[PDB]
Amino acid sequence: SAGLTGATKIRLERSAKDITDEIDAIKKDAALKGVNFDAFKDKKTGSGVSENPFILEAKVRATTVAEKFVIAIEEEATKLKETGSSGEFSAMYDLMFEVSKPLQKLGIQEMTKTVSDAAEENPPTTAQGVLEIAKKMREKLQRVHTKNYCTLKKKENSTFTDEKCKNN
């Protein structure tokens, strides 16, 4: 709870709500049409085809709002520099986990693991320490749209039995 600063606190609170509130709208819209909305059992196979592209495409709109959230940490880290102490930074990591849960139900990636796995590499003890995770978050988190964007491109590619798909 040790964290209030200026309007930065209330700013994150409102910006955080948009996270669940946005992705939630998807579930409401899905109600209109009879869709399984899941198929996360073990591993999914079909790539858009057969597998109601709703989930795949949705996985993009869901991470869309969350993505912006990650940047907040990076930008906030600069202004956070002040004070410092693992106590203040710890409050930043909390937001990640708290937000990592909602996205978990949907099924994005091994974020909860990737983010925690990075802690061993460079245990966030300074402002620069958080920057590492931030980059890892935005970079990987964005990968979610990469697969959906590349997979869907299968229609345009059609043939071409040689597409590494590496635009980054």
Curated annotation (Swiss-Prot):
Changing R14S: In strain: 297, LP7 and Sh-2-82. Keywords: Plasmid, Signal. Changing T146K: In strain: 297, LP7 and Sh-2-82. Pfam families: Decorin_bind (PF02352). The keyword Signal applies. GO terms for cellular component: membrane. InterPro entries: Decorin-bd, Decorin-db_sf, Decorin_bind_prot_A. Belongs to the decorin-binding protein family. Binds to decorin which may mediate the adherence of B.burgdorferi to collagen fibers in skin and other tissues. This is Decorin-binding protein A.
